[PDB]
Amino acid sequence: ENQVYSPVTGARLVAGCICLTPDKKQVLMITSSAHKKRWIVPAGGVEKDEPNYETTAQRETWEEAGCIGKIVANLGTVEDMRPPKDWNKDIKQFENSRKDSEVAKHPPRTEFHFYELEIENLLDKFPECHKRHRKLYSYTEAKQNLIDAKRPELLEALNRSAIIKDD
Ligand SMILES: [Cl-]
Ligand SMILES: [Mg+2]
């Protein structure tokens, strides 16, 4: 009940961090709680008492990854546009035009506010350290992880960061 939603779309409001090594060659990824083999980035729900998205982003990066660092860029917003739960059993799932197909119009599940963080430390004891793994990946590896995880919005956020892409 401490969760915050868009007053317009009803999307859950979430913040998180693209956590880069100081040399900008790697990004910190974490395993999903539900799916141990899916690698994503730290992010979670804004809570009602939190004054800004940076606070949520750095809290969730601590809770989920045991990562501390400095926010160095605002990477703006991305949206989880996965269709609702009922979607694949509904009668009209797609809206087609002359040269294009789209999933039927729906609000986003989640609106993510992403920041780029420069990693200053990784701690062995952190709140979710027995529920998740946290590991550095090159850009090429991280991109494949996020496609494997079916989270293109997280890849959109990563691509806005200063991560070195030509591995
Ligand atoms: Cl909003
Ligand atoms: Mg979360």
Numbering used by the authors: 21 to 187
Quote the original article.
Our analysis provided very interesting results: First, three mutants show prominent increases in thermal stability in the free state (K63A, R171S, and Δnose) as compared to the wild type. Both basic residues are very close to each other and other positive charges. Therefore, it seems that removing the positive charges relieves the tension in this highly electropositive active site, especially those for Lys63, the mutation of which apparently increased the thermal stability by almost 12°C. As mentioned, Lys63 is not conserved in HsDIPPs; however, it is conserved in MsMutT1 enzyme. Although ScDDP1 failed to crystallize in the absence of ligands or analogs, the stabilized ScDDP1-K63A allowed us to solve the structure of DDP1 in the unbound form, revealing that no important structural changes are seen in the active site upon binding beyond minor side chain accommodations of a few basic residues. A retreat from the active site of the mobile Ser-loop (52-SSA) involved in phosphate binding is also observed in this mutant. Some kind of activity decrease is in concordance with a less efficient polyphosphate binding being more evident in the case of K63A mutant.
